[PDB]
Write a protein that binds this ligand. Structure first.
Ligand SMILES: CC(C)(COP(=O)(O)OP(=O)(O)OC[C@H]1O[C@@H](n2cnc3c(N)ncnc32)[C@H](O)[C@@H]1OP(=O)(O)O)[C@@H](O)C(=O)NCCC(=O)NCCS
Ligand SMILES: CC(C)(COP(=O)(O)OP(=O)(O)OC[C@H]1O[C@@H](n2cnc3c(N)ncnc32)[C@H](O)[C@@H]1OP(=O)(O)O)[C@@H](O)C(=O)NCCC(=O)NCCS
Ligand SMILES: CC(C)(COP(=O)(O)OP(=O)(O)OC[C@H]1O[C@@H](n2cnc3c(N)ncnc32)[C@H](O)[C@@H]1OP(=O)(O)O)[C@@H](O)C(=O)NCCC(=O)NCCS
Ligand SMILES: CC(C)(COP(=O)(O)OP(=O)(O)OC[C@H]1O[C@@H](n2cnc3c(N)ncnc32)[C@H](O)[C@@H]1OP(=O)(O)O)[C@@H](O)C(=O)NCCC(=O)NCCS
Ligand SMILES: [Cl-]
Ligand SMILES: [Cl-]
Ligand SMILES: [Cl-]
Ligand SMILES: [Cl-]
Lengths: 234, 234, 234, 131
């Protein structure tokens, strides 16, 4: 009924400082649509097996493993730049941030070394961070050393987004809601296709659009043809 | 064949000032598509009733009243922050700005206290502002006090946008053109669906993606099912 | 492996400077889809005529000629602004940047005076630029004096993007990948439409949404209805 | 020369791609008569792809001191039912395992075979635990 002023305090101060710092980064945005039909079917087949082992298996572990495979080819997306952008540190660990919605607000823990982990282990680490995240119990180790971030806003809604990069990282992807849309198959007939949008943001000071685009294409081909991931996993 | 330099003068100086101030805000972007099939039908049905009371009825009154109801659930989107972003002021009045194209060109008056007004009253105040707007006779009062803004760029063109927040506001929505697209109904059949895109921008220092995605879903659920708006109005 | 630090060197030093400068600009973004079915058909029937004259004809000469015709109507889009945005310098030449991918990364040469050239001359000039580009042999003159940029990221992938304006330019366009999507014709039948996305960014200090929108529409009508371009060409 | 049995080392740490790379290496060496000592020794288990020439079932002989072997027949297209009861083109392969019955029982070979087979029938089940 009246106006009400109220201090920004406690953990809310971190979002302020992080996003203010991100003003220093000139964001380039690139978007695509990915055809997740085969992946929806794949995830249905594997959901039981995961369930029997005590794991809820969403799409994220796939998005994460495909990201990491992309980062092997485009290691500049898993990198950091210094205050003046004079040097790049290419980071070897894929510590991939999971932006996560909580009752208390936004928090971003990461899954360490996705590069050495199976989809199933990623699923397992996810659950763990989700349980911990919702209980206010994430450790300091869960919150530091992130190298790259994915923000599945699509578990709530959306198509495209424009996500803000977390310094000191240089890139971030946001995933919209998987939605059934009419599309052509190879014959030229209209099918039910499960389509998801992706929105990447990158530090345009050292990352150009061809790089992001080729990264996205590789990422995309892994999810549109999960077979492709089999070739090189161990 | 000749280059020409020219001062920015008169009202044009205002846009320079606003948009420069907007650089201090780290913009988060979030987008979605909204099925406006029922609302187009609803509006057709109200057009003659509105005409007879001497009022042009577009979609904007629907959008506005839906935004207001949303803001009641997410008051943080109707708020300001101070210079260093250390205090939030939750504003009680929904004075929703209407970005308006005129011959001189860009101006943003607002409809005061939407939260107390019917769709019909919002139509009436909108007409009044359009009348004064295209004659260059908007008063001072119609221009100050904005708490939130909608930008109907879709009356001219477009799908998605990246609109820029008007300080000291913290969010803004842009609406693209309502276009007929092939979409699936519940029965799995390809229908004619009246799709509109919306793109929101919000001050990421204090507003996370979950909050805007939820606000967006609520707004959207009101427009996708106008019925639901019936439920709580007096 | 292990982390590796490394200096930013050589022609990479340019992208850091340029993209930092772009922070001074409040970017407004506006996107649309454009139906290229007719242009695809047109281009197919001109390919053999261009090949026979020694030239590869992509869609870019069409996009560039349309853009130029658009800039004649909305010349504020081929303009620059001074250090504090006090004066606008409208530029007569349309020297249109072609964002271009090479082994050494991103380079932006331009085609000089598009306004006075034919679709075939543009293509010729574009080809001269591709040959020099991929040889790393572009000259200083090919690189300076740009007034406006198009970025055909779609030759690699994508739908929408958020391209960054190259100062002292004031606008940029990004084109996504042309892709067959189910769309309605006038008769209300579902058919195969070659859809391309376009994303525009403009310096919102002096250019409003209405302006970009109208420009985009004109640009778009030239591409949707290629014969509209006949009318005023000499 | 006749029959030769080199092995791919440490399949358990290699990817399908690297396994194929090593197969190519061995096929080439093997057909030049150049397989080396180290390629011939340390075998722990054996596959006999006789189906690259012909066959359905087989009775392969285990190579001591290993305790098991599988032979694979020729993949051929046979009428099979799908999940609806309709008749489909199905690419069928037979497998034959021999095991040392002094220590391996039939449930073991069967359970192992079920598992091997679910990986092949449902390749994405292999996705789940590879790194
Ligand atoms: C932490 C988080 C990423 C976990 O995501 P997750 O691995 O998908 O796990 P969730 O438990 O939330 O989701 C599981 C369910 O939602 C569905 N879902 C998740 N992502 C989806 C998508 N993009 N499209 C459609 N459905 C989706 C899953 O299919 C699953 O449904 P089912 O259980 O009926 O099979 C998610 O909870 C979250 O916090 N999202 C918000 C991120 C955010 O706030 N971003 C903005 C940053 S400013
Ligand atoms: C002030 C303004 C928002 C009022 O919009 P409005 O309430 O829709 O009223 P209008 O008189 O402009 O529009 C009326 C017609 O356009 C149509 N229209 C309006 N919005 C539409 C949309 N988003 N999609 C499709 N059609 C639309 C309406 O259906 C109506 O059509 P009809 O009379 O045949 O039934 C609008 O005129 C305007 O200035 N838009 C531009 C906003 C802008 O410049 N933003 C840029 C910010 S940088
Ligand atoms: C220099 C450049 C713009 C020239 O593009 P171009 O004139 O289309 O010429 P190209 O030779 O590269 O491409 C021609 C082929 O690709 C196809 N293609 C080009 N643009 C396309 C589009 N957007 N959608 C689908 N296909 C397209 C053309 O049809 C042509 O096809 P064809 O050979 O089968 O007949 C382009 O090669 C390039 O470098 N793109 C990168 C832009 C970029 O880096 N942007 C990011 C900036 S941060
Ligand atoms: C070394 C060897 C195992 C390699 O097998 P491989 O990995 O399939 O490689 P090849 O070059 O032989 O394959 C040739 C083709 O035959 C096909 N083929 C191989 N095995 C097949 C089988 N199980 N069913 C149907 N086709 C088969 C492959 O698809 C490949 O096909 P393509 O070229 O048309 O795409 C094989 O060449 C061999 O020596 N076979 C005989 C085994 C034997 O002697 N065992 C008995 C021990 S007493
Ligand atoms: Cl920027
Ligand atoms: Cl669509
Ligand atoms: Cl930002
Ligand atoms: Cl901005």
């Amino acid at each position: 009924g009246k106006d009400r002023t109220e201090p920004v305090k406690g953990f809310h101060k971190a979002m302020v400082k992080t996003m203010s710092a991100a003003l220093k980064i000139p964001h380039f945005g690139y978007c695509d649509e990915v055809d997740l039909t085969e992946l929806v079917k794949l995830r249905e087949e594997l959901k039981p097996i995961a369930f029997a082992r005590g794991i809820k298996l969403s799409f994220m572990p796939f998005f994460l493993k495909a990201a990491s495979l992309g980062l092997l080819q485009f290691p500049i997306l898993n990198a950091s730049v210094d205050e003046n952008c004079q040097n790049i540190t290419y980071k070897a660990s894929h510590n991939i941030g999971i932006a996560m919605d909580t009752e208390q607000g936004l928090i971003v823990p990461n899954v360490k070394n996705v590069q050495i982990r199976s989809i199933f282990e990623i699923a397992t680490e996810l659950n763990r961070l989700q349980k911990l995240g919702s209980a206010g119990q994430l450790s300091t180790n869960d919150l530091i050393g992130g190298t790259f971030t994915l923000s599945n806003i699509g578990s709530i809604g959306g198509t495209y987004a424009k996500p803000v990069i977390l310094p000191p990282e240089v890139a971030i992807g946001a995933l919209g809601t998987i939605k059934a849309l009419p599309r052509f198959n190879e014959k030229g007939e209209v099918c039910k296709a499960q389509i998801m949008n992706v929105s990447w943001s990158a530090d345009h000071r050292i990352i150009d659009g061809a790089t992001v685009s080729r990264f996205s294409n590789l990422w995309k081909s892994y999810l549109e043809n999960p077979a492709f991931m089999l070739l090189d996993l161990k």
